[PDB]
Amino acid sequence: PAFSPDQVSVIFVLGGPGAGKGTQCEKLVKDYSFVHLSAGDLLRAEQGRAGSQYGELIKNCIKEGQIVPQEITLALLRNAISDNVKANKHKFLIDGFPRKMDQAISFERDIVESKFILFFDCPEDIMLERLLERGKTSGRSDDNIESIKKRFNTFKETSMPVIEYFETKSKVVRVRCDRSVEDVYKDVQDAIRDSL
């Protein structure tokens, strides 16, 4: 592994699209010393980087709601962790990763064993009304119903197997998404007070 769990403490923050991962992580970094890395943000930044050989590939995976190949994802991830660790940041909230078993096992074998997975358990009809409203507010390119159906599909098929894998290892803490932002945060806080 490039790191001992001493050096780098990683919590994976998982859940379907619109479950509130981005929202809870940005509140948490106000109260805790964790650095938040969003895998979809690292990807959208590479996609628009002048000189990227991956621009079209990332653009098309996001549009189609596909999992971008792990080699690309992992390298972006590894680099962002390395800059923080050099900048002397040892605790990370990795949001949106791993989304597929291969990413999951490569990360934990080559980089670092995670502390635990915070999983936002969320009903799909709730995720769907939050993404159509996010679509109106922010106008993110994949927050359109054709892409939303591909992202829900990929989530059930590819990403839920990973949840079930970490659950065998007793590393999953489920939090319900369907309460107000402030009531979901209280349970996020109780889960982290308990899990360190």
Ligand SMILES: Nc1ncnc2c1ncn2[C@@H]1O[C@H](COP(=O)(O)OP(=O)(O)O)[C@@H](O)[C@H]1O
């Ligand atoms: N861990 C990952 N591995 C591969 N592709 C990813 C990963 N995370 C995000 N992506 C992608 O970029 C898109 C948007 O991700 P993200 O912004 O994290 O979305 P969401 O709001 O749906 O949680 C995903 O639908 C997929 O195409």
Ligand SMILES: Nc1ncnc2c1ncn2[C@@H]1O[C@H](COP(=O)(O)OP(=O)(O)O)[C@@H](O)[C@H]1O
């Ligand atoms: N508990 C909540 N109740 C209502 N809207 C929420 C709640 N949590 C997050 N939202 C939002 O609904 C959308 C999805 O949340 P977001 O954090 O962006 O999710 P994710 O990162 O899982 O895709 C955003 O517009 C955000 O403002």
